[PDB]
């Protein structure tokens, strides 16, 4: 038994609500929230720059450090940060960016990051201003985490399309 309440379940392991994730993370304190990363941590917009928005940059001070020491992520990829206030962890998670013409089938390397977390609240990756079709997204996700995810989706018309094209 966990916290996340008002989700509609999915699959054994999938459930999805229409939420705000900030909102959603400031009210659950999950132990791990996924960001809709990129490979340099910078957190300007869409998922990102919401999450680090609520933390009034402290997200982003502790990434620029986390850069100047290692260097960028892979798309793909993932680092474990500071949940700072939403989170006991952020899970920054590198789906590739349509509209900078990465390859697709990256999805599902950056989906597998979640499986080394038990429990996660996430955000469809590469939706939104990351491009891809959030449906393809989501059936990524079914077919990619065996883990238990909880998925935020802030559009409530995007997340009555998802429920409704679910097979
Ligand atoms: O969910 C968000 N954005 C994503 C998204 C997916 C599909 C359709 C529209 C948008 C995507 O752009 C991303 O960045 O993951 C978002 N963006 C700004 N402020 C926010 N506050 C809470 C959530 C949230």
Same mark, same amino acid.
């Given at each position: $038994?966990?916290?996340?309440?008002?989700?509609?379940?999915?699959?054994?392991?999938?459930?999805?609500?229409?939420?705000?994730? $900030?909102?959603?993370?400031?009210?659950?304190?999950?132990? $791990? *929230?996924?960001?809709?990363?990129?490979?340099?941590?910078?957190?300007?917009?869409?998922?990102?720059? #919401?999450?680090?928005?609520?933390?009034?940059? #402290?997200?982003?001070?502790?990434?620029?450090?986390?850069?100047?020491?290692?260097?960028?992520?892979?798309?793909?990829?993932?680092?474990? &940060?500071?949940?700072?206030?939403? #989170?006991?962890?952020?899970?920054?998670?590198?789906?590739?960016?349509?509209?900078?013409?990465?390859?697709?089938?990256? &999805?599902?390397? #950056?989906?597998?990051?979640?499986?080394?977390?038990?429990?996660?609240?996430?955000? =469809?990756?590469?939706?939104?201003?990351?491009?891809?079709?959030?449906?393809?997204?989501?059936? *990524?996700?079914?077919?990619?985490?065996?883990?238990?995810?909880? =998925?935020?989706?802030?559009?409530?018309?995007?997340?009555?399309?998802?429920?409704?094209?679910?097979?």
């Amino acid at each position: $038994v966990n916290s996340f309440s008002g989700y509609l379940k999915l699959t054994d392991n999938v459930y999805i609500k229409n939420a705000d994730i $900030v909102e959603e993370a400031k009210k659950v304190k999950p132990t $791990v *929230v996924v960001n809709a990363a990129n490979v340099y941590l910078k957190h300007g917009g869409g998922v990102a720059g #919401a999450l680090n928005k609520a933390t009034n940059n #402290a997200m982003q001070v502790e990434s620029d450090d986390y850069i100047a020491t290692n260097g960028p992520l892979k798309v793909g990829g993932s680092c474990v &940060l500071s949940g700072h206030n939403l #989170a006991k962890h952020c899970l920054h998670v590198v789906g590739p960016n349509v509209n900078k013409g990465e390859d697709i089938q990256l &999805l599902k390397s #950056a989906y597998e990051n979640f499986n080394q977390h038990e429990v996660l609240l996430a955000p =469809l990756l590469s939706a939104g201003i990351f491009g891809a079709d959030p449906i393809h997204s989501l059936r *990524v996700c079914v077919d990619t985490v065996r883990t238990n995810v909880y =998925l935020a989706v802030f559009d409530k018309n995007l997340y009555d399309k998802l429920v409704s094209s679910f097979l």
